[PDB]
Every structure is written in C-alpha cells, then in structure tokens.
Amino acid sequence: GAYKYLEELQRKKQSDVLRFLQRVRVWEYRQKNVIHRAARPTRPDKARRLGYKAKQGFVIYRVRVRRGNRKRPVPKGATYGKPTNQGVNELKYQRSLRATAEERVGRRAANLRVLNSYWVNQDSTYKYFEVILVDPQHKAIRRDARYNWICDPVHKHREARGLTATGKKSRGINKGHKFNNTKAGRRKTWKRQNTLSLWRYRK
Amino acid sequence: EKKERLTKEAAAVAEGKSKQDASPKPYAVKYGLNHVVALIENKKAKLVLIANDVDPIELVVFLPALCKKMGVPYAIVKGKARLGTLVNQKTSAVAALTEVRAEDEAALAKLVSTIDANFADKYDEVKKHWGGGILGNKAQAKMDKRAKNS
Amino acid sequence: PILKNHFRKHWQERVKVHFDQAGKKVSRRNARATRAAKIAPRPLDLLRPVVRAPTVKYNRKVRAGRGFTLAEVKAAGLTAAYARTIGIAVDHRRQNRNQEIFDANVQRLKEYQSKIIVFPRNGKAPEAEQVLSAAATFPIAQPATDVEARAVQDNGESAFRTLRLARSEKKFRGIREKRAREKAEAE
Amino acid sequence: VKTGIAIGLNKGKKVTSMTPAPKISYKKGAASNRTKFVRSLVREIAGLSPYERRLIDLIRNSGEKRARKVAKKRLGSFTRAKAKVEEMNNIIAASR
Amino acid sequence: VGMRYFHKQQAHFWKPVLNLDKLWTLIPEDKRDQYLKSASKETAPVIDTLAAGYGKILGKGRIPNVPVIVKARFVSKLAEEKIRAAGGVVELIA
RNA sequence: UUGACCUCAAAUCAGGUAGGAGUACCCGCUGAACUUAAGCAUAUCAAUAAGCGGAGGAAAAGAAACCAACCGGGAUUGCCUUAGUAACGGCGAGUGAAGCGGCAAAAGCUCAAAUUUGAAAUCUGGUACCUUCGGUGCCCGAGUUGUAAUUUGGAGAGGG
RNA sequence: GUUCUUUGUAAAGUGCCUUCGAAGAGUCGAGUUGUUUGGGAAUGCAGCUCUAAGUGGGUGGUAAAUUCCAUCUAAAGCUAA
C-alpha cells in the first residue's frame, strides 16, 4: 500500500520534488483565511497515524499562526521593577506555536473536540498547521466504542488545558530522572513538598 | 446484483450442500489504491491506469517509478472522474486489471504494446528534462519582439 | 549551634494537620468490609511473587514483588490470560535470570492451585466461607543460607591479602593491558 | 561469572543463571526485506538534498577528512557524520 | 572545600561496623553457653554477620579462645589475625 | 447539447450543539513589588498575590525511550522515611530534590503500519411496522485518497 | 434461586516444523538566545538557524575522541482506587 511510500517520501523535505510542492502550497495558504476548512487532509498518512478515520464526523481545519517571539505588552518598555525585568525583546512564550494553533480553531468550532494536530508548511512570517477534530454529537462517534471516550465530559477543551500530544510535551510530562520538577504536574508537586505536615502525635 | 447473488447462493447451500461452487469465478478491475500497490511488487498486474490529476499529488508520484521497477505496463490516463464511472465510485485514482477472460486475451496483449511504446520506453529520458518554461503571452510577446529586433 | 529553618515563604497558607487520622481509619475499614461483601467468595488481594531486592544495602532481604512472569506461569502449566482470573498477578516486563527464585515461585504456584477451588460457570455454587487474606495464607519466607554449626577447614589464604590483592588488581588492570599490547606490537 | 567476594573485577554472589527468552522489543532496528525495497525506491525518486550535493563535490576534491568536518556541523553530532559520509562513498561506488 | 560528588546516594557507602567485642550477641542467648564450652574444631558456630546487618568486622577487644567461623564482606588485618589465634576461619561472602 | 467530478457557496433548509454562573480543591498560561541581605544591582520574597483561558465529583498522572550497577527491580498517585543530605549560591543571606526500604490502593490495555480481493463484508440519515435509552425491512447518502474482521511488540502473522 | 427459550458447519485457548516479523519526521539531535528548578561548558520548556539514521535510536548526573557493556523502545491514544 501507499502507507510506507508516503511515510518515506515526506521525510525528504529538501529534495527537488518536495520543495516544489512546498513552494506552490505556501502560496495557496496565504490567499485564504487564517482559519479555513480543509475538505480532506493534504498529508493522508500523517493524518491517519494520528487517528483520522475517513468517515462522517472527522473534520480537518487549516490554521495560520505568526512566527516569532513574544513582546511584553507594557507601555513603552517601562517595566517598573528591579533592573532585571526591563528585558522585553528576548521573551519566548513557554507554549509552542503548535498549541496556539489548536486554541484558535478550538474557540471557533466549540462543539467540535480537537483530537490532535501536525505540521504542514512554513514561511518566514507564518507557520502552518492542519488540525484534526472530532464531532462528539454525531451518531457515528457516540457508538463504535473505539471513539466514544471523547464524548465523556472530562474531555471538554483538551487543547486549552494542555492535554494533546504537543500539550503534554510542552508541560514536560514524560518519565525519567530528568523530569523531577514536572512528573505529576508542576504546581501539584510544588504544593506537595512546600507543605508542613503535622500529625496528631507529633513526630 | 450482490443482493441477488446471495439469495441465489443461499438456496443452493441448504438444498445441495454445495461448497459455494455454484458461484463462478469473477473477473473485474481491481481499483483500491492500497490494493493496486499490493498487486504490484508481486507482479500480479497486467495494466495499471493512473489518473493525472490527484489533489494530494504526493499520493501517486511513486507509481511510475514503481511500475517501471517491477515491470508492470503502467499508463497515465486522463481524469480521476472517468475512472470512477467504470468501477461504481465517484473518484478512483487508479484502476488495475489482474486477469482477463481467455477469449479477450489477444485484445489485451495488442493494447499493451501500444502503451509501453509511449510510457515505459520513454521513461529513460523523461527524467532528463524539466518542465515549466512557459510564460504569459504579454511577457512572451515582450521577449520575441526584442529577440527579433536583436 | 547554627540551625536552618525554611520559613521565609508564606507557609501558613499551606499547613495540613491530620485530625482525620482516626476518622479515615474507620472509613477505610468500612471500605474493605464493603469490598469483601461485593467480592464475597474471593480473598480481597491477588497472589504475589517471591523477589530479592536490589541495591547492595538491601539484597540480603527477600520481598513481595508485583507479578510472576510469562515464564514462571507457563512452568506451572497455565496461560497468562487465564492466570489473572484465578487471582494471580502477572508482570510481563520482569525477567528471570536466577534459578532459586525461579524454583521458589513455581513451588508457590503448585501450592496455590491446590488450595483454591474454582466454581463452575453453570451453577450450584458451593458455599466456601472466604478467607480475607491471601498473603497470610501464603507467607513470604526468608531463605536459609547455611546450617548452624560446621567443621573448620583452614587453608592459610589470610583473608585480608585476599581483599587487598583483589583491590589492586582492579585498579591496575588497564595500564598493565597497555603494556601487554606494546610488547605484542613490537616488530 | 562473578567471583564470590565483595570487591574486585567480578563482585557478587555466585548463582546459577537461566539466560532467559529474548525480548522482541530489542530487535527494533533491523529493517525487513520490504523496507529495504522501499527506501531504495524513494532515494532514486527524491534525489540528493542540497548539502548532500555539497558533500559529493567535496569528497572528490578535498578528501574524506574535510568531509567529516562539514558533515559534523550540518548534522548534529560527530557519530552521525560517520553514518552520512560512509553513505556517500556508497553513492559514488554505485556511480562507478 | 574538597571535590564535588554529583548524585550521591547512600547505598554505595552502606557499611556498618562491628567490633570483636560483641560478636556473640548475634548468637541467640540459650545456645550461647553451649558453644562457649567446647574447644571443638569439629563443631564451630557459623555466624553470618551480613544477615544481622553488619558490613565490616573490626578488631577492638579480646575474644575467648573458642574457634568461630565468621562470614563477612570486609575484615581488617587485625581482626582476621585475632580470630586466627582463636582457631577460626574467616570466609568471605558476597 | 446534455451528464458526472473537484473546490467554493447560499437557505427562517432536516436534526443538533457552544457561550453564561459557581470558581474551596484541579490543568495551563501570564506575572510583580513591599520584604531579607543591617546599604544594594545579585539572590531572596517566588516559579507565589493580582490578571486571563478550561474541567469534574474528583481532576491530573499511568501501563517505561523507567530506576539501576545489584543474587537485581517493574504502570501512576499518597504517607512514613531518604533529608535539611548530595547539590547549587555577591559560596554571602539564603535555597534544597531524587533511587532503594515499610505501608495504603491495586487492573490493565488500544490504534497507525499485513490484499477481504472469490465479491465494502462497515456506517449516518429518511420512511413504514414493532417487543422503543432501541429493533427489523426497503430507499437515497457517506465511502476504495480506505469504512469492517485479523495484529500492538509481553508479541504476532502466513503455510504444515 | 426459579422458569421456559439454544444461540454455532460460530468463537476462543494450548503443542510442534518452517518462511517471517511491516513498529510514528521539520520529529529525535546539535548550535545560539531567553526562561526555569537541587541539576553543577548546560535539568526542563520555548524562539530561530541547521537537520538525521535502521544490527538503528535514547539514557547510564564532568566536556571530547576511541573501544566496550548494561537497560528500555520516543516523536499517536484510553482507564477505576
């Protein structure tokens, strides 16, 4: 099948064929809106291993975000503080641009639930993403229990709490000795160890 | 026909205890894209038709290189819309034919000799040139007038 | 004396005092008693392996592990799929590379299937009067190293020069091998 | 084989070993028959990337010593530069 | 002051010491009076110093003349000499 | 000249859904200074108060790209302990984890990636009837740029 | 517990012999710049530039080269106490 040939040929992103497609498709994506509906995924293999199943109730959105840092919104660079916090242009915004891309399509299509997302194309001004969303009200999803777990109301707005694939990365949630400050969540393991525990019979 | 064929089998199964030899062997085009690519690389295909316009172009571009490798006589037909009509879909994007009836055998081998003369034989020198030198006609008249004057 | 206390933060916001210790104990025993009525013939916990601890300080002990293996369960004569229904924990990621631990867990399995009786699916359900602790029925036994008294055999190896030469051989192993190749590479 | 004393080249108790069944998730690296056929097919389609073009003009001119220094810096590390320049010797050998 | 030790863990350095003074409290109380009244090399009590939780055997006092088989990870020079005069071997266990 | 296809639209179209409130606890983002250092910029206060986004009866984490250096352990959480220790700091003031051990609770697993190819075997909707959190039968539709069945690395598949 | 309904030429499990064994990309990683905590020529995350491999890849708390050995299988996902 074309599963493996598409998997390998996408990896050669500087070959003479793909930089042709990367330069044609970057023109098309500027001419549309910031958020607009993709009728079908442009990368079908990469969509499919993330969980896309071509049936009724899986919606692909295409989104455009700004490249660059984050400039602090204080007026005229006057931070009013100890002479550290004067830094303005070097500030870097702890969430990635990928999770910012998931929130704009999330706040637009609010009935939909955002499943995952992936990279497509980039430019000096904009990065481009293509986001897979799931419809929880559609009857093909409320049945067939591979996917009825998303209709559970604890999965409301996964993209905004940081539970997606790039959400759990940016929080720094993996196993290991490196991730001590963030293994059970950062502010949970802060409050755990900055707490004076006092039993009845004092130890 | 399948809604006709199953009850035609079902009367044969209970009455005659037949092993579904009541249904003959089928011959039809094999049409799914992951199914055509699996029929190639086993050398099980006779002709592979390729639609030229596919909206994610990256899907199909390895097929003229893969059909040259395993030795299957590919063709690049025009239209994914035409290929859907012969196989009862809207769009098809490939159509491959494994087998053919024996009375129709000589008609196939004549057709393959015309197709390979255009596509599989030209494949050695298709790779050595680049397309896209066309310009707009206002720009095309601009340089032809100058080159005539120069 | 110098004394270090870390109380510069707003520490009075995060102070947890455990008045509920005597309260949570009564709630926890009612949790076990409610479970033991729901699971009414079954012994409230799964069966556990005999496992020797890591970390040179603790390797003399032996300890109840998580689950057996796929190898120890097959040696007793049952699949891993059926083993979880019997009450036997299965840990797929552990491996056996010792024999005395392997022989201890298998004998722990041969005893277990004799002590249990499994009811038929069909019915008639013989009343069995559950025993609430599977760990107390199959205790974890400390293995015995040696006998109490032996005879003295003495070879004069001096037992400290033994430790000394074993130390120096590790330290000077690498440089002596560099000498041993330079003799070999000559001419 | 451990010796049986506390310190040395082989410390620790002598116990009989079982050398158990090999885990399947150790052979993740070995490819297939099929993936070798796929990757050979994609390389002739895609062609060489632009820095790989700058290696095969550099090995033919300035030897393999300077080629590992550029391939150290375009890629990440030095041990990945061995895996790339060894591939570019296979490209020229297939050419001639 | 000295050099730094990144990632220190007190399992590498677990080694509690035992002097030759006690050496018999490891043996239980009721059997103790029998083993002190025998000079037999044929029946000598085996004391496993690791199982009681002692890393090293050090020589600090004087011990009686009964031969004793000792199992230990580490012994000093003077401790192994003082047991050898009593007629007791020191077997190294791991 | 009709008839498809692709992309893009409209309708008080058929049926649906989101916003707001609460906000003790939970997941993020953003983010100060008074204060301590007998000054102070560093550091501290603090990855905290304020501001903003999003949930539940719990949330979050979770079935190892783990800890280890052992005769080896075995998903995550919580407690006792490791420990005011290793470690970092105008090495000043100050800050400060994790692995083992005991215990509470215990539960595992699912896709992508294999041609059903001797048969898209799958699914929403519309309408009749019914034993209605649904079921059966016909008709359009989705769909071959991939919906079922089989497989998830502890394995597993194809022939015998 | 008691009662009438049998779903199945359906489904599951185990022994042996062979050929096999598909396993996630602007990602892992590196450079620099900011931010973070005990993480100490770099503990996380983020911006930009560069950008892999398949007996490979990550880690093994002092950088780099060279030779080994151990251990797990990342870049997709769910789940009570």
The three-state DSSP-derived secondary structure of A39-86 is CCCCCHHHHHHCCCCCCCCEEEEEEEEECCCCCCCCHHHCCCCCCCCC
Give dist(CA C135, CA C87) in Å, integer: 12
Paired with A129 in beta bridges are A63, A119
Cβ-Cβ contacts under 8 Å, A196 against chain C: 11, 14-16
User: Is residue C125 within 8 angstroms of chain E, CB to CB?
Assistant: no
A202 touches strand F (CB under 7 A): no
Closest residue by Cα to residue A96 from A76, A66, A121, A138:
A66
Q: Look up tokens 């009964």; give the residue.
A: E66
Paired with E17 in beta bridges are E56
DSSP line for B48-95: EEEES--SSGGGTTTHHHHHHHHT--EEEES-HHHHHHTTTSS--SEE
Paired with E69 in beta bridges are E46
User: Tokens at residue E63, please?
Assistant: 């011990």
Paired with B75 in beta bridges are B49
Cβ pair B56:A44 closer than 8 A? yes
**What is the number of residues in chain E?**
94
Q: What is the dihedral of CA C158, C163, C167, C173, to 10 degrees?
A: 60
Quote the minimal CA–CA distance from B94 to chain D in Å. 20
Which residue from A minimizes the CA distance to B60?
Answer: A2
DSSP line for chain A: -THHHHHHHTT-TTSTTHHHHHHHHHHHHHHS-SEEEESS-SSHHHHHHTT--SSTTEEEEEEEEE-S-----SGGG---SSTTTT--TT---SS-HHHHHHHHHHHHS-SSEEEEEEEEEE-SSEEEEEEEEE-SSSHHHHSSTTSGGGSSGGGTTHHHHT-STTHHHHTT---SSS-SSSSS-HHHHHHHHS-EEE-SS--
Cβ pair A6:B33 closer than 8 A? no
Q: Give the method of determination.
A: cryo-EM
Q: Which CATH class is domain D15-96?
A: mainly alpha
Cβ-Cβ contacts under 8 Å, D21 against chain C: 71
Interface test with E, best of D5, D14, D15 (most E CBs within 10 A): D5
Interface test with C, best of A191, A194, A201, A203 (most C CBs within 10 A): A194
Quote the minimal CA–CA distance from C8 to chain A in Å. 11
Which nucleotide has the least CA–C1' distance to C39? F106
Give dist(CA E51, CA E72) in Å, integer: 9
Q: Tell me phi and psi for residue E57, to 5 degrees.
A: -105, 120
Count Cβ atoms within 10 A of the Cβ of residue A197 and give its class: 0-12 exposed, 13-18 middle, 19 or more buried.
exposed
Please give the helix or strand (H or E) that residue E18 lies within, else none: strand E17-19
Cβ-Cβ contacts under 8 Å, C22 against chain A: 200
Cβ pair A2:B61 closer than 8 A? no
Give dist(CA A152, CA C164) in Å, integer: 67
* A106-113 LR contacts (CB < 8 Å, sep 24+): A106/A157, A106/A159, A106/A160, A108/A35, A109/A59, A109/A61, A109/A133, A111/A135, A111/A136, A111/A137, A112/A59, A112/A136, A113/A150, A113/A155, A113/A156, A113/A157, A113/A158
D94 touches strand G (CB under 7 A): no
Q: Where are the domains of chain A?
A: 1-203
A192 touches strand F (CB under 7 A): yes
User: Is residue B41 within 8 angstroms of chain D, CB to CB?
Assistant: yes
**CB neighbours of residue A8 within 10 Å:** 18
User: Is residue C96 within 8 angstroms of chain D, CB to CB?
Assistant: yes
Quote the minimal CA–CA distance from D59 to chain E in Å. 44
Give dist(CA E11, CA C54) in Å, integer: 10
Give dist(CA D34, CA D42) in Å, integer: 13
**CB-nearest partner of C56 from E14, E76, E80:** E14
Cβ pair B37:A2 closer than 8 A? yes
Show me where chain E is broken: residue before each gap, C-N > 2.5 A: none
User: Tokens at residue D75, please?
Assistant: 């890629």
Q: Which residue segment(s) compose the domain that C79 sits in?
A: 15-120
User: Tokens at residue A171, please?
Assistant: 């929080």
Cβ pair D42:B69 closer than 8 A? no
Closest residue by Cα to residue C64 from C77, C47, C40:
C47
Q: Where are the domains of chain D?
A: 15-96
Q: Which amino acid is at D71?
A: A
Q: Look up tokens 């249904």; give the residue.
A: B23
Q: How far is the CA of B113 from the C1' of F80 (A)?
A: 85
Interface test with A, best of B34, B50, B58 (most A CBs within 10 A): B58
Q: Is the dihedral of CA D83, D89, D90, D91 positive or negative?
A: positive
Q: Crossing angle, helix C173-185 and helix C161-171, to 10 degrees?
A: 60
Radius of gyration (Cα) for chain A, nearest Å? 21
User: Is residue A40 within 8 angstroms of chain C, CB to CB?
Assistant: no
Given resolution (angstroms): 3.6
Paired with A196 in beta bridges are C15
Q: Where are the domains of chain B?
A: 1-136
User: Is residue B35 within 8 angstroms of chain A, CB to CB?
Assistant: yes
Nucleotides of G under 7 A from a protein CB: 1-2, 9, 13-15, 20-30, 33-40, 43-57, 59, 61-62, 64-66, 72-79
Nearby residues of C15 by Cβ (< 8 Å), 6 or more positions away? A195, A196, A198
**CB neighbours of residue E89 within 10 Å:** 22
Residues 80-99 of C with CB under 7 A from strand F: 80-81, 84, 89-95, 97-98
Give dist(CA A110, CA D76) in Å, integer: 42
Please give the helix or strand (H or E) that residue C63 lies within, else none: strand C62-64
Interface test with D, best of E76, E90, E92 (most D CBs within 10 A): E92
Cβ-Cβ contacts under 8 Å, A199 against chain C: 18, 21
A156 touches strand F (CB under 7 A): yes
User: Tokens at residue D35, please?
Assistant: 């993936």
Task: Name the DSSP class of C152.
Answer: -
B13 touches strand G (CB under 7 A): yes
Residues 4-43 of A with CB under 7 A from strand F: 4, 36-40
User: Is residue B37 within 8 angstroms of chain A, CB to CB?
Assistant: yes
Q: Are D89 and D83 in contact (CB under 8 A)?
A: no
Cβ pair B34:A43 closer than 8 A? no
Give dist(CA C137, CA C114) in Å, integer: 13
User: Tokens at residue D82, please?
Assistant: 């061995």
Cβ pair C21:A197 closer than 8 A? no
Nearby residues of A157 by Cβ (< 8 Å), 6 or more positions away? A106, A113
Interface present between B and C (3 or more CB pairs within 8 Å): no
CATH of domain B1-136: 3.30.1330.30
User: Is residue A3 within 8 angstroms of chain B, CB to CB?
Assistant: yes
Centroid of chain to Cα D75:
14
Q: Are D8 and C169 in contact (CB under 8 A)?
A: yes
E17-19 and E56-58 beta bridge pairing: parallel
CATH of domain A1-203: 3.40.1120.10
User: Is residue C4 within 8 angstroms of chain D, CB to CB?
Assistant: no
User: Percentage helix, strand, coil, to 5, in chain C?
Assistant: 45, 5, 50
**CB neighbours of residue B141 within 10 Å:** 11
Residues 72-111 of A with CB under 7 A from strand F: 72, 79-85, 91, 93-95, 103, 110-111
**What is the number of residues in chain B?**
150
Which residue from D minimizes the CA distance to A20?
Answer: D46
